[PDB]
Scaffold this active site. Structure first.
Site, PDB file in Angstrom:
ATOM      1  CB  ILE B   7      -0.975   0.073   1.174  1.00 20.94           C
ATOM      2  CG1 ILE B   7      -2.089   1.012   0.847  1.00 20.94           C
ATOM      3  CG2 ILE B   7      -0.330   0.167   2.434  1.00 20.94           C
ATOM      4  CD1 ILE B   7      -3.538   0.800   1.571  1.00 20.94           C
ATOM      5  CE  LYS B   9       0.911   4.163   4.320  1.00 22.90           C
ATOM      6  NZ  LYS B   9       0.422   2.601   4.567  1.00 22.90           N
ATOM      7  N   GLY B  10       2.887   7.941  -0.248  1.00 23.39           N
ATOM      8  CA  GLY B  10       3.994   8.856  -1.196  1.00 23.39           C
ATOM      9  C   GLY B  10       3.940   8.248  -2.482  1.00 23.39           C
ATOM     10  CB  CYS B  11       5.596  10.252  -5.391  1.00 22.58           C
ATOM     11  SG  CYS B  11       4.928  11.956  -4.840  1.00 22.58           S
ATOM     12  CB  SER B  12       8.977   6.700  -5.127  1.00 18.88           C
ATOM     13  OG  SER B  12       8.891   6.632  -6.497  1.00 18.88           O
ATOM     14  CB  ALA B  13       6.789   7.036   0.173  1.00 20.27           C
ATOM     15  CB  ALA B  14       4.802   1.801  -0.850  1.00 20.32           C
ATOM     16  CB  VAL B  15       4.047   2.742   4.960  1.00 24.53           C
ATOM     17  CG1 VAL B  15       4.871   2.444   6.096  1.00 24.53           C
ATOM     18  CG2 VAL B  15       4.381   4.159   4.480  1.00 24.53           C
ATOM     19  CG  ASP B 167     -36.763  61.263  11.902  1.00 27.34           C
ATOM     20  OD1 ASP B 167     -37.787  60.747  11.275  1.00 27.34           O
ATOM     21  OD2 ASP B 167     -36.361  60.715  13.072  1.00 27.34           O
TER      22      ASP B 167
END
Lengths: 409, 343, 635, 635
Positions: B7, B9-15, B167
């Site tokens: 999966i 989380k990041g452009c080339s980052a996958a945790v 007024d």
């Protein structure tokens, strides 16, 4: 190329046949003729490749160079100069491709044929690394191995030279350990000294009074100067103390009980400068989880807290109470109901003259201890010292302003 | 090492969580645009790396690739939740060309150099209104008569919006007093027959003069239509110029037609304070002409010259000198002249 | 007399050429209306298919693909349309502005969701802008293939036979100039097609042999790559789908790793009504406020297609962060269609936007946890708007939580400061402090504690703008105790004895004034504070110390005014303070005494240190204190 | 196989209608291209008149006039054109997009200053937007009068029934709908001409019976009012301009009671070249920065007709105050003509604009008196740009003058300080602060005075922005002495004895540190303090007390990152200060003493009072001082 011109007609002491060290300097500043090795210097140098290449760094502003040691490895070329380098002299260097700061080196950072050479202006070059707690400078004649760093609790194999400070001193080459020096009467700075001692690295020791047996006074040796103390200790070999990743909770309990008994002995013998780091090591013992049966988690922590107690006790005995604050603050972080611990911390506070936080914690301890008179009399002394600082400012500040009016004509 | 679920989380980052433990490997292509960025954000993600945490393999992959990998400071770019890592990529032949740049190894980031000026906005100081500051400070009768202009203008403008109020209150206008010592009319004018709003402006003029207000004490309050006792002015002090007093006498006239529209006053007041009164200008020396506006705009220059102590005289002049038209600009001059048709 | 009545004629060459080189400013627009034509074509025929299944029987496909064909520079697109008769094709093509699609559209009796995107008739010739020759082979229902030709040469024809059947094969080839040879770059095409035409309820893709030519080793021989990806949600009716729908949607919209906070969906039913659908991010937007390219975050659609968006026309600068997308299928448009004709409509839809999103904020405030999270990270924008809106101030007033003496720990609504147990002297007592402590340790604040009424803390650099603008929240008015008045209803015994102190200390105050020249306007005995001998209080008007401080440092605010204006200064005492009475005693007896002189110097000085004002001349204070130190040295 | 080649056909009704209701968003566009048709008409014929004497006599005075007619609502304009023949008139007119003006224009062999405003051929049909029927009677050269008719009914005709000759009488009547019946209001017409068509080298006016109907009594019997009280300066030769033309022009351009400062005129000769002409006001603009919308700056009047302007793309946000007007007769345009096609050209013209106006600033700086006047009232905008431009740093530099230690009274150029370079200082010393007295009286500044090194004093708020961007000017670098380093080359003997002081006082640094917890990372002896025992200096990085202040001060800035940020603080001593050595003494004797503690408390405290930082907790300081006062009371 300036480097090329200077290189010609230079006697070179070379490690290899075509690689080595090249006497090349332009002028020689007057400095100690004897060769000296210094870790602390503020050398001025101009890193310029020249020779059809350009060094853009360090050429601009002369940079003091932190020499790690006589065999410092931060920059290989830098030490090569220190070979037969005087103090307060001038020096110049030459290219050595192998001697590059980034290991072997890469061609863009370091030219393949040329390293960084500098027209060194040598400055004071004597002495080795000092002691952060003072009393000793590195006085060695061999190199460490990085493999075998003695550790607290490792009983050692040290030999002794036989003359301290210029006096033949009485001792033997005994199986020392951090908690043993005070028992057999030699310079006790040995504890934090053998740190920089490994296997096969000879290192004589300068001793200051507040670090070793100096301040402690000698009835057996016969030493005139308590601050001028020098002698060589030969750590032949040594065992390894069993450490955190090395001990186990059962042996933890074993050495915990044994040191607790030792702590009573330390108290009976009254000696405590040994006890500082051994109590600290018990602290660190417990400061990590054991992941084992801890029905007596309380008993373990109680050993720990009594250690806190005697630690603060010794900090009261000699120290300036900052480490007392440390030990008893860890105590409060664990057991703050110490019948004596926080009491001695507040007593330090009053002897720290902070009698207000002393008011606070002293009334606290009186809550928990309405029995004894020591803490109540101590908080009374807090009131006394408050009034004393009062009368102090009273005197020093009587119409302090009117004095300004005197100046007015 | 076994690799966990893929999966990203990041452009080339996958945790992924390795069999518990975990590791992520964000890759730096050596020929990309942000390749320098990824070869350096590594260090940012490897800020929290332990003392021995980068044993980079250093054959042609550079020794320095993980020499300055260890951190120096704590600026928190993305995260600080990292312990260990490794330089794992194309191990052999990853580039037909890489210069092996090797330039300036120990510089750090300047806090992203984000210091652009966030757009500014000013505030309109509104702690005061008319009847408050009037008793607080009494300004020059021209500094006051100028405040009158701000009134009638919106009064002109609001009826120019066709809207009407019977007024307006005494304090129906609020005073900015944004710069200290000078009052100001509300631009918004939220608080609320022809010339009715103008009559209210005439009535509150007495309050500015500090003279007793007849529409209040004497009576006829709240009605523009009501008129009695010949619209008496109990304005005894001569601080106010007789010429402008003639205009006040012209105000509250028998007929609203002989009364001026608020633009006429604007006209008058534009003509009166600005412009200039001279013997050469005397005798209606101004007649039908368009350029004279610029010539008059020149005669309004000296507002900066004489008695420009209260700096506000320059502030609104721009929005006033620009908007003028002789069609509703010559009549007041004719009626001003009457100040001098006094004879 | 004689009438030579003629209808208007026209010329073709100049007309066409003009159209080409004038009608639009953006070259890339061409690949949008190609799609639009395709779309409506397929759409009509779809409806027809649902009527009768003959066309689709053979077709059985709805996709649309583009072929760059670089090796021949032959750009082209293909559709599954029905196309038109060889003749009728002409009759709607060569007839500029005659939309055959708009024709049959109108002809439709039961026009259900026709959604005809293009009726203008100028979209097709937009090709010559890029195309050198516009050629298009096509089949039709029960008809033969026909290759139209064009190159904007004034004429056209057809010369076709034996062409690949490819069913209807409603494709059109393009030939861009050697010059300005762009758009062969696919990723350009992609940013284009998500700049516009990314939302179409019909299959789209591109194909290209792009590979790694690695000889097998390469994963894919050809890039059959679709571009439809996310489907338009807002068209589907809300309350029938879960939040994840919206969630996934925005995720594939902005590509935020993080989720969305909340979102709201509004079916408009007005005369010109629309889809109103508005997210709010679950995080705070990091990079913004430089206004480089963005004035808002809202987007607008008609006929289910990308329109001009991001204009300060629809959403005001305040609350610009709001991200949602709006669509009313049909609005007045232009030929370029980019600009808009009437802006009054922009105003009425803006009304709707702000009303609705503000109600969203409200519904959020129904929550306490998440709403507080938001409020935390966005109150600044809130207040900016609160002071800029000037109509719906009352609603703007709500949704504001703060630290108070009632609160302490957490923020809390003004309404919470409303509802008071004492039910006495109803005002909103607050203070614009710098650090929360530096607002909690003011002697006047302590006197409020002595009375016991709570006080709200205002601690933001932007907070000021709000306090001047805010007023009379819920029929009761704000009061910052730092004001000069601070009228507090105290006891009869309190009021009179205080004033008796006043009547025998006004002489002491005058005595001080004889030294306190040139700084204070009026120094009077005040009960404003307790447990502090003296302090300063700003006058009834002007700038408070925090207010003055921000004005001085505000960017580009320097002026003759900013330089020195808002000049209002006055301090007070603590008549029941020890030091105070000492100052009072024997003050009359001493004449020209430095003792009391330099004393009140330092006194008033420190009072200015407190009460905020940056020290008028620190160095001097340091000097005095240095004198006190030298004293401390027995010197 | 075969080819049904046909040219493109067209339809008229839908075409025309579309044109009407789509080309232009607003009805205001009319009354501009009417003028255009007349202008070029008269222009051509003028040239023709020059050639033939008889034609010149026939054409006579040229004028363009308007008649609203009030209640009749018969709008109309009249021109002195030649018109077109009975048929040829058709052949241009009914032929949409066939402009006979462009026709004969092209036909012109010696096309000298033809300046044909219109070329599209669609302006006449734009009249429908307002007109209900477009009817136009006209004569031509040796020809008869002819009343064309039109109402966009698809057809038209020509009827000749003795319309009053009016000589040539070229003119078109208009009939606006009852609905949207505007533009009868003349002053609207005037602001309309002021907006566009105010610059035409030909006579224009309006006539209207407007009077005061006062019955003689009425001031003017009839109202005749020309509106082109202006003549375009750009056309006129620069350097050959009339004396004081610019001053007069500035008043005509904008209604400024005051004059202009300076102005510059640039004949461009590039591929697309233009008339660059740029004023600069002799005053500061009261109304600037408040308007978020980018406002009027340089105006574009291509082809001597006002076009779209005041859009940032011409000139950056910085230097937007500048006022001038640019015009290139030839430029790519649209049907609405308002938007623009290529913006790369905007960039090239923008580059030209900034280069040139910057050279203007330079030429100004050649002056000292007026240039200083400007610099005074505009340096803020200058610096904003100086930090935003990021390319022409050298051009931006050398234009800045500031107060310095050398001459406090006069603003000295940085270049002047650079030429001084005392002792070949490689560092330019400045300081950033708040008040001039405070900056002059600073510890480091006093040390600089002792070194005789001069320090430029910067007291400007916005100063921090530009200075961070600004750097080594003239190959030598800026240094604010408030930095931590402040490396000063002293004597070798000085360096060492100061080092000896450090060798004996570092244990004092210890001693104090044992009290100076939690505040200062490192305390060391200083070479920067002579008159002050102690002071604080910001670390090597971070934000100076005042830099941090303004960063903090700037509103709309509060961020999670902002709350804890730029934490860099530490102080120093004056080893040769009396108090300092006293602190040294007795500290050795007692390691812990309340006095020593409280002393360094107050010391470091006041040091923070100086060195800028707002007091971290004033109340507390006041408390301590109150204690000192109670002391002073013998209590």
């Amino acid at each position: 190329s300036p480097t090329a011109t200077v290189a010609e007609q230079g006697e070179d002491i070379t490690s290899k046949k075509d690689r080595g060290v090249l006497k090349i300097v332009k002028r020689v500043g007057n400095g100690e003729e004897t060769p000296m090795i210094g870790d602390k210097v503020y050398v001025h140098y101009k890193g310029k490749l020249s020779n059809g290449k350009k060094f853009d760094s360090s050429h601009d502003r002369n940079e003091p160079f932190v020499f790690s040691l006589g065999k410092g490895q931060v920059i290989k070329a830098w030490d090569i100069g220190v070979a037969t380098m005087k103090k307060g002299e001038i020096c110049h260097l030459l290219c050595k491709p192998e001697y590059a700061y980034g290991s072997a080196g890469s061609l863009p950072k370091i030219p393949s044929n040329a390293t960084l050479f500098f027209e060194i202006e040598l400055l004071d070059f004597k002495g080795e690394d000092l002691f952060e707690d003072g009393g000793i400078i590195r006085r060695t004649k061999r190199k460490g191995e990085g493999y075998s760093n003695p550790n607290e609790g490792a009983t050692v194999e040290i030999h002794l030279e036989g003359r301290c400070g210029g006096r033949m001193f009485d001792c033997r080459d005994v199986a020392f350990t951090v908690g043993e020096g005070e028992d057999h009467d030699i310079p006790i700075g040995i504890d934090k000294a053998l740190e920089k001692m490994q296997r096969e690295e000879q290192c004589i020791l300068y001793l200051g009074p507040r670090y070793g047996f100096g301040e402690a006074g000698k009835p057996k040796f016969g030493i005139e100067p308590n601050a001028e103390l020098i002698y060589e200790v030969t750590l032949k070999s040594f065992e390894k103390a069993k450490e955190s990743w090395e001990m186990d909770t059962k042996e933890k309990l074993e050495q915990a009980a044994i040191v607790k008994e030792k702590g009573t002995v330390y108290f009976k013998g009254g000696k405590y400068m040994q006890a500082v780091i051994q109590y600290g090591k018990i602290v660190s013992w417990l400061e990590m989880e054991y992941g084992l049966s801890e029905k007596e988690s309380k008993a373990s922590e109680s050993f720990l807290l009594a250690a806190f107690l005697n630690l603060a006790m010794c900090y009261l005995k000699l120290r300036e109470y900052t480490k007392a604050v440390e030990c008893c603050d860890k105590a409060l972080g664990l057991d703050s109901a110490n019948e004596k611990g926080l009491y001695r911390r507040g007593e330090a506070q009053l002897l720290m003259n902070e009698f207000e936080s002393a008011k606070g914690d002293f009334e606290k301890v009186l809550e928990v201890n309405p029995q004894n008179k020591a803490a109540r009399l101590q908080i009374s002394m807090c009131q006394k010292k408050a009034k004393e600082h009062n009368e102090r400012d009273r005197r020093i500040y009587a119409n302090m302003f009117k004095k300004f009016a005197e100046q007015d004509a | 090492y076994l690799i966990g679920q893929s999966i990203g989380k990041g452009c080339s980052a996958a945790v992924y969580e390795a069999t518990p433990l975990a590791i992520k490997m964000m890759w730096n292509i050596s020929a990309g645009s942000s390749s320098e960025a990824i070869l350096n954000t590594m260090s940012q993600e490897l800020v929290p790396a332990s003392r021995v945490a980068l044993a980079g393999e250093y054959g042609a992959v550079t020794y320095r690739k993980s020499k300055r990998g260890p951190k120096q400071l704590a600026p928190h770019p993305n995260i600080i939740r990292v312990l260990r890592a490794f330089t794992s990529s194309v191990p052999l032949l990853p580039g037909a060309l890489v210069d092996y740049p090797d330039v300036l190894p120990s510089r750090l980031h300047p806090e992203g150099l984000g210091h652009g000026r966030t757009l500014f906005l000013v505030m309109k100081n509104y702690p005061c209104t008319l009847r408050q500051y009037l008793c607080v400070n009494t300004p020059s009768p021209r500094l006051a008569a100028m405040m009158l202009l701000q009134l009638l203008e919106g009064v002109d403008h609001l009826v120019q919006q066709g809207i009407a109020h019977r007024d307006l209150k005494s304090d129906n206008i609020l005073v900015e007093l944004d710069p200290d010592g000078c009052p100001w009319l509300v631009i918004a004018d939220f608080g609320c027959y022809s010339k009715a709003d103008a009559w209210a402006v005439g009535a509150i003029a007495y309050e500015i003069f500090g003279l007793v207000n007849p529409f209040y004490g004497q009576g006829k309050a709240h009605l523009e239509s009501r008129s009695y006792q010949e619209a008496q002015l109990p304005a005894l002090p001569e601080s106010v110029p007789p010429d402008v007093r003639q205009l006040v006498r012209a105000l509250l006239q028998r007929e609203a037609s002989k009364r001026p529209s608020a633009r006429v006053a604007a006209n008058v007041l534009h003509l009166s304070l600005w412009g200039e009164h001279i013997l050469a200008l005397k005798n209606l020396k101004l007649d039908k002409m368009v350029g004279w506006l610029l010539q008059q705009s020149a005669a309004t220059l000296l507002a900066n010259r004489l008695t420009e102590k209260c700096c506000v005289e320059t502030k609104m002049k721009m929005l006033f000198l620009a908007n003028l038209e002789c069609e509703t600009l010559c009549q007041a001059a004719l009626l001003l002249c009457s100040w001098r048709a006094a004879l | 007399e004689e009438v030579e009545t003629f209808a208007f004629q026209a010329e073709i060459a100049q007309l066409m050429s003009l159209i080409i080189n004038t009608f639009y400013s953006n070259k890339e627009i061409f690949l949008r209306e190609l799609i639009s034509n395709s779309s409506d074509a397929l759409d009509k025929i779809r409806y027809e298919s649902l009527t009768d299944p003959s066309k689709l029987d053979s077709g059985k496909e709805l996709h649309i693909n583009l072929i760059p064909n670089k090796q021949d520079r032959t750009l082209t697109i293909v559709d599954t349309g029905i196309g038109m008769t060889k003749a009728d094709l002409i009759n709607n093509l060569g007839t500029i502005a005659k939309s055959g699609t708009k024709a049959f559209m109108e002809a439709l009796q039961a026009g259900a969701d026709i959604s005809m995107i293009g009726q203008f008739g100028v979209g097709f010739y937009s090709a010559y802008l890029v195309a050198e020759k516009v050629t298009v082979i096509t089949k039709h229902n029960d008809d033969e293939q026909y290759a139209w030709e064009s190159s904007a040469g004034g004429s056209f024809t057809v010369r076709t036979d034996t062409g690949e059947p490819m069913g209807r094969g409603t494709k059109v080839i393009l030939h861009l100039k050697e010059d300005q040879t762009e758009y062969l770059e696919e990723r350009r095409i992609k940013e284009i097609v998500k700049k516009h035409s990314q939302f179409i309820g019909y299959p789209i893709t591109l194909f290209v042999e792009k590979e790694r030519d690695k000889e097998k080793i390469k994963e894919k021989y050809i890039d059959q790559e679709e571009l439809n990806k996310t489907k338009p949600i807002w068209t589907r009716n809300p309350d029938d789908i879960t939040n994840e729908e919206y969630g996934e949607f925005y995720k594939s919209l902005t590509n935020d790793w993080e989720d969305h906070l909340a979102v709201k969906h509004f079916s408009v039913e007005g005369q010109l009504e629309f889809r109103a659908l508005l997210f709010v991010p679950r995080r705070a937007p990091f990079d913004l406020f430089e206004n480089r390219k963005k004035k808002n975050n809202i987007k607008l659609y008609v006929r289910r297609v990308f329109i001009m968006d991001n204009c300060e026309e629809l959403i005001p600068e305040y609350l610009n962060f709001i991200r949602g997308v709006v669509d009313s299928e049909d609005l007045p448009l232009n030929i370029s269609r980019e600009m808009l004709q009437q802006s009054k409509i922009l105003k009425v839809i803006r009304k709707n936007l702000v009303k609705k999103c503000l109600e969203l904020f409200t519904e959020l405030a129904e929550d306490k946890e998440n709403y507080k999270k938001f409020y935390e990270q966005f109150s600044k924008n809130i207040k900016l708007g609160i002071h800029e809106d000037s109509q719906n101030r009352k609603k703007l007033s709500e949704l504001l939580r703060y630290y108070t003496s009632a609160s302490g720990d957490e923020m809390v609504s003004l309404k919470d400061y409303c509802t008071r147990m004492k039910e006495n002297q109803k005002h909103i007592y607050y203070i614009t402090g710098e650090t929360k402590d530096q607002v909690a340790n003011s002697a006047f604040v302590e006197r409020l504690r002595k009375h016991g009424l709570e006080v709200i803390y205002m601690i933001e650099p932007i907070d000021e703008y709000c306090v001047q603008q805010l007023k009379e929240f819920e029929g009761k008015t704000l009061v910052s105790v730092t004001k000069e008045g601070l009228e507090l209803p105290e006891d009869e015994e309190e009021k009179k004895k205080q004033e008796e102190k006043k009547t025998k200390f006004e002489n002491l105050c005058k005595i001080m004034k004889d030294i306190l020249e040139k700084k204070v306007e009026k120094v009077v005995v005040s009960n404003r504070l307790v447990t502090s001998p003296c302090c300063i209080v700003t006058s009834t008007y002007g700038w408070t110390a925090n207010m003055e401080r921000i004005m001085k440092a505000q960017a580009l605010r320097d002026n003759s005014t900013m330089g020195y204006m808002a000049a209002k200064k006055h301090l007070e005492i603590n008549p029941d303070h020890s030091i105070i009475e000492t100052l009072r005693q024997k003050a009359e007896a001493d004449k020209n005494d430095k003792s009391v002189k330099d004393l009140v110097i330092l006194l008033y000085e420190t009072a200015l240190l407190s009460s905020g004002f940056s020290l008028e001349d620190p160095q001097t204070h340091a000097n005095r204190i240095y004198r006190m130190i030298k004293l401390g040295l027995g010197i």
